């Protein structure tokens, strides 16, 4: 139930053509923040949440476009960057832990993180077309201390727009150079 | 008994985490941890099966499967009765005291409502299995007096932090039209015949970021506009709207009341996708959606429905009942004063609200050739049941903007009093 | 090879009829103390014992009676309190750990804990009939420091009478109100 | 070569944890942990299979399966060759020295004995796989001199804490009778014909907590009484004994010696279940078990066999050999002094024991109408081979209680010496 | 690419005949040091390496001789010492951990350890014949701090001759006494 | 472009751990760990499958399977595309700052080369999957400026410690002869006819530890001797060589150059196993390997090829090009001075090297009946292009030992200059 603003700023200092670009790891997606559930502890207890995320839960999200279909995005990304399809066959685990402070309650929730790939079409200044792919990476926990009387900011529980919890990146490769 | 300041439709409400049933019905178990010892309770997911809990006021329509489909529309929840997410609690007892470690399963409570005319007609409650709760405390005395207590009422309590997040979803029994080309400054959309049989949504986006006036021809019926939640960033085409099937929608402005002749002034952004809900129109003549980019300070109405007020030739009471905006948001009213335009004022006007409190600003709407312009005439701190009279020029057009400051009732009532 | 005493004290402040009662978590049963075995460490080593107790090891113990058969006990308990049959299908793990002190030996042993349910018949003062059900809960470790020359009290190794390692409870529901 | 102060029957003895075989035959392995490092050895139960070890002096009767059935009777051990119980050791080496972490499998040693006339006729040893042992020590020098040592004797050593816990079990080749109704103050039980073919047990409970005299008619044969271990709390019926199939039995008092004409004085509690073992009686006339509630200070004999002493009309030595109670427990002897009752004392009596030491109390048993009463005549600090003479009234009944203080022999010998 | 020297020293103070001898735990074998791979961490991170070594990875190494074949070695070792064949059916885990120091990089590698058994033939002074058996025991980690500019000694990465990381042992049993 | 001071053959080179591909192609993922929190990334081996990477200059001969067989010969690597070895990283963030935890898969890089005449003819690179890499650093600002950077060159970088370990392996297309009996002080081995068709190896061991002269009859062809790596300790027989199939071989001394008439002086040990590589000899007459134990200070040549120098009756330049020993190792040259033996010196001799620097020692080889003896005549600090002249007796035998001190070229050139 929220949103930001964007008028412009799509300038790209590179020649005409098509590019596959790694936009970085650590992306979290809108409205799915609490899908995996959350965890409550208190009074010096250590809480641990994790996941051994395999092929059947590592769902990629494709956002294709007129000239860039899903297969095209997949192949160009997997040729230059990590082969996520192959990697999905080998289970990897991650977990977070935090100790609830003394005489207080702690709430912790988990969500998946992603690597964002884009496939862009450019005309010597600006992006004319952009396809997007989110590849499942790992995960990320938000935590907060609370009591029953306390109101919590909406933005803690809920992301309305995709963002990166790390620094965004722009690592490019010209395709059909 | 809160008021929900929203139009008719389906809504999914996340009512928070840490829900569990009474009488230790979700108790996994308790560890007694001796001083200088650590104890641990693990949910290792050796089996993936989880057991969601479900209630509904209408099993036929709001079925578990249906409710799940809406949870997916709203929050993109994939898995309902499985999980690969482990949880674990570790507690080390101090050297002086022993510790009781009590762990429970928990659920996240989602509420699907069918909201009609300020009322919840149907309600489903879906309890998504969650990542548990741990209570650590001083170990009880095994010689503690046994108190005979009755089993308490059968239901749920919440042990997690306060949460109430509302996400509207596209009504999936209403169809979606799409304007593929991003709209220019001036666009007219012909509404298809299907509108005769049920309401529909129309998905679109603007070519240039700016303020837009949106209305039907003759300003009837009233419209509703939404943002698609999460549509920003993501796939884009210069000359084409990129549909990414986002069914999660954020209400901006508009209403259902069939007699609310009106238009919408809304700030729209290039990177976002929007939905307009056109209600069913049983008329056999073709209706239109008219978009019009607006330069100038008409932007002051930034996201509001402008209610056009009519037949106030008579004197005294003129009540208009409309769906109230939430606290902080706008509802506006347009008046063209009866009589011909020279510079005489019409039997002075006095503006008050009757259910909800608000701030309120009176504007003079000009017609000078650069678009429209607004001149501020006056502001009022309080609108409810108290207000001072003011004289307005005959044949002049005024707009009265209300900014809601307290929401006591689902509807806000507006009174344009013509005293003398 | 031991026992306590009981002359009376079965007074219950409630009306005539039948009741299902939760007697609390943390019950341990007589003569099975060391059935799972024990663990020996020394000189600053941390010893850990645990169990991922599943359906085939979580054996309930029914002690039925003339008017309260096993199915009757099961249904009334599972209707008001936790459904242990359903819960038994989902593996839960627990473990304990303790660090052996410097230059000494530590012995640690594990046993299961239980929730005790009773189904009682009462005549406005006292219990005429009582059925008992122990539902597998979790587990509990006793530890002691030792040397080869040291004698250990029998009561450390052996429980001759069922008891609760926590506070006993008496949470009741009238059945066929 | 300890003395086991128990009647004939089957016993399961937990002889402690931490047993392992010699010559590193149960060594899992050794970690060398460098300074500032941690090392870990886990038994994660990826397989559930465990390997119990077993010995028997009689493979046909005391088979592995049979021994297991008794282990279950005694301790309720369910699983013998599987486990879901993981164990793990974690060791962090200090910054100055390296550490050797050596881990072994271990076993808990249970011993099943057939105990007859103070002798073990058959013996089975069952080694239940247990949760391991870890030895941490300073890491050895790899240049340490290699000493040529022979492999030592092939067997077991114990590395866990000292333990010796004896639990008797119902002999499963002897049948169990049941008195369903909880017995009143006075009850007579007719012993069925099956007693002609083998000994049996009779399961019962008392209606009211108190002291009870229990005996056969004519006080032969001798009886044995046991407590069912763990029967307290649990299922109950007001007018019915709740049989919960507890085969674990705790010896209270009684003996096997066929000529020990006697009765039992025992404190019995409402909440417990008891067993009386009646030996085989080849007689064709029907025998009885007689229960009799006793008010008054006959309770001083609280759990004892009262041996009735006969034919001491002759003077001097009168030896009676009986199974010794354990240190701290009672054995009693009843004397009715020869001659008619006026107030003359019979050729003074002197009481001594001959194998085991004990304290000893002489009582005068009255017959005054309120039940029986006991008047203390004298106490003796030591009974063994030293004692002072005392004169007792003719035709009077005296009881001599011995409280054992040292157990040197399986049998205690009692001597009622008539001097003059 | 290295080696040591040996002229003599095979004296054994025992009578004529054949012997099975436990030479101790903690043996590591030549040229397989880094077969399992290695692990790199930095800046206060804790690195953990381990293995749940089962039957199909616990490969024994037999070095038989004229009069002592593989079956002969196996039977005499398993009769007197631990039955490794039986033990191989039950999975055992081990792991090591070390914290990388602040502002430096840590390299850690794992290799299996072994118990060394020998079967020797002696003539009242010296060994005439020796068969050798390495039974998989557990494992052992070497670690070192490093930077990209630093040279590391060959002997850190590579063992050219079998050795024991603990004290060697000589525990014997006369076979066919 | 390093120089590899080794004879012809196959070599497997461990070029270190921590290899990974560019452009995060082996990135598992990144955790953002908030202050006072811990984060963990695990490779738990729930699947055993690993993905080795492989390159070859000759797919037909140096295939993946072939390369794997050599990796096993060299390092005894069993598993190439599976693993049960778990790895895990745990990072706790301080209370002041957040941490980025970035984890990658890694590989250990092995290089199989076919090395011929100082050149690599074929090359295979095998990347064994390894136990990962973790980078922890201060968490980046999410508002950090996005710099547009191109994807860098496609290949590998090394992140582990510097490593370069060379292990030669028996060429499996060359057959292995075996002398089963450990050789005595004097042994002559008849080389089988198979030598006509390809080179072979001959496996042997000495009965007594000592220095040995080894040569073909007529000192042609040149020989090469290796140690079997790991053969020490292990199985032994007094009167028999115990073959344990060790294909990993360490080069001691010798060369391939077909005109290098020579013998070898090598220190050999009883506990080790050795290989001599005899090249193909197309001759139809039977060749021999002659072993000869040497007592006395001929041991000074400890592991060296002794090149026999001929036809230096002419004056001035006499160049001899031979494979250079590595820095620190010996190459030797034997001279018998032209003319009959009285005590006149031959037109003074001057010895210099031309490619590689070395120390150098001139010996007088005597023939006095106790074996051979060496008398030191002179030493030279530097041999390369500078040296002083010296007079040597006619008909006398001298040996010149060079100890290499810098390796600039694959071949060392020796010059025996006869000045006047």
XYZ file of C-alpha atoms in Angstrom, chain A residues 1-8 10 27 29-54 57 59 61 63-66 94-95 107-110 112 116 127-132 134 144 146-152 154 157-163, chain B residues 6 14 16-19 44 72-79 83-92 101 106 108 110 128-137 159-167 209 227-239 242 244 246-251 269-272:
148
model
C 0.000 0.000 0.000
C 2.808 2.442 -0.957
C 5.077 3.691 -3.782
C 7.882 6.061 -4.903
C 8.424 8.271 -8.004
C 10.480 8.262 -11.245
C 10.481 10.970 -14.020
C 13.608 9.945 -16.036
C 17.975 6.099 -18.100
C 17.628 -7.831 -4.619
C 10.977 -8.288 -4.512
C 7.827 -6.309 -3.734
C 4.973 -7.791 -1.571
C 6.525 -11.098 -0.769
C 8.405 -9.984 2.380
C 6.720 -12.263 4.892
C 5.823 -15.199 2.636
C 8.170 -17.614 4.468
C 6.836 -16.587 7.896
C 8.529 -15.124 10.943
C 10.042 -16.049 14.267
C 9.520 -14.782 17.840
C 11.868 -15.138 20.814
C 12.580 -13.387 24.117
C 14.802 -12.902 27.150
C 18.262 -13.939 25.912
C 17.139 -16.762 23.622
C 18.965 -17.203 20.321
C 16.618 -17.529 17.352
C 17.767 -19.168 14.130
C 16.047 -19.227 10.750
C 17.370 -20.727 7.534
C 16.686 -22.664 4.366
C 18.295 -25.427 2.274
C 16.862 -23.978 -0.938
C 16.710 -26.531 -3.761
C 11.716 -23.748 -4.379
C 11.768 -20.100 -8.712
C 11.101 -14.562 -12.232
C 9.893 -10.321 -17.201
C 10.410 -10.634 -20.962
C 9.773 -8.143 -23.738
C 9.034 -7.820 -27.482
C 21.949 -20.495 4.556
C 20.832 -19.319 7.971
C 10.650 -10.669 15.847
C 12.573 -11.925 12.816
C 11.409 -12.763 9.289
C 13.023 -14.291 6.213
C 14.686 -14.696 -0.552
C 18.938 -9.037 -11.012
C 17.490 2.378 -23.012
C 14.655 1.763 -25.504
C 13.747 -1.709 -24.239
C 14.507 -3.649 -21.041
C 13.790 -7.243 -20.046
C 14.395 -8.297 -16.431
C 15.527 -12.318 -11.049
C 12.849 -5.776 15.317
C 8.661 -5.269 20.110
C 5.921 -5.346 22.713
C 2.143 -5.807 22.375
C 1.434 -2.074 22.745
C 3.924 -0.911 20.097
C 3.053 0.197 16.552
C 5.518 -0.805 13.817
C 4.587 -0.403 7.489
C 6.973 -5.581 7.017
C 6.360 -4.580 3.418
C 8.334 -3.623 0.306
C 6.157 -2.129 -2.420
C 8.958 -1.727 -4.975
C 11.848 -4.042 -5.881
C 15.108 -2.865 -4.332
C -11.775 1.900 0.489
C -2.054 -9.402 6.662
C 0.354 -10.199 11.601
C 2.589 -13.049 12.682
C 2.752 -15.078 15.898
C -0.853 -16.295 15.904
C 14.593 -29.282 10.682
C -1.014 -15.256 -4.297
C -2.472 -12.240 -6.144
C -1.795 -10.030 -3.130
C 1.502 -11.233 -1.657
C 2.758 -13.801 -4.217
C 2.667 -16.599 -1.636
C 3.681 -19.761 -3.501
C 3.613 -22.488 -0.855
C 8.033 -25.379 3.647
C 11.818 -25.791 3.362
C 12.429 -23.014 5.888
C 13.880 -24.369 9.109
C 13.650 -22.655 12.485
C 15.578 -23.241 15.680
C 15.895 -21.826 19.201
C 18.985 -22.096 21.417
C 19.016 -21.142 25.093
C 21.889 -21.288 27.578
C 12.193 -23.171 27.256
C 2.725 -20.112 14.983
C 0.578 -15.630 9.960
C -4.393 -13.313 6.398
C -0.200 -19.545 7.022
C 2.140 -21.770 9.063
C 5.047 -19.655 10.306
C 8.458 -19.924 11.987
C 7.484 -20.401 15.634
C 7.658 -18.744 19.040
C 9.924 -19.354 22.018
C 9.213 -18.355 25.638
C 12.149 -18.557 28.031
C 11.601 -17.975 31.730
C 1.933 -13.141 20.149
C 3.790 -11.309 17.352
C 4.142 -7.573 16.736
C 1.119 -5.445 15.778
C 0.500 -5.534 12.035
C -2.311 -4.604 9.671
C -1.355 -4.385 5.992
C -4.124 -4.085 3.393
C -3.595 -5.125 -0.216
C 4.801 11.989 -16.079
C -1.646 1.582 -8.943
C -0.270 -1.868 -9.779
C 1.935 -2.656 -6.756
C 5.509 -3.525 -7.791
C 5.219 -2.584 -11.476
C 8.014 0.036 -11.261
C 11.553 -0.884 -12.397
C 11.070 -4.294 -14.262
C 10.366 -4.791 -17.983
C 9.833 -1.761 -20.211
C 9.175 -0.878 -23.834
C 9.311 2.683 -25.213
C 6.183 2.378 -27.383
C 4.723 -4.192 -20.461
C 3.638 -8.387 -15.955
C 0.401 -7.858 -11.287
C -2.983 -8.398 -9.631
C -1.982 -6.514 -6.454
C -3.520 -3.049 -6.634
C -3.205 0.095 -4.513
C -6.265 2.358 -4.337
C 4.187 8.478 -13.348
C 5.808 7.062 -16.503
C 7.394 4.032 -14.791
C 4.146 2.774 -13.170
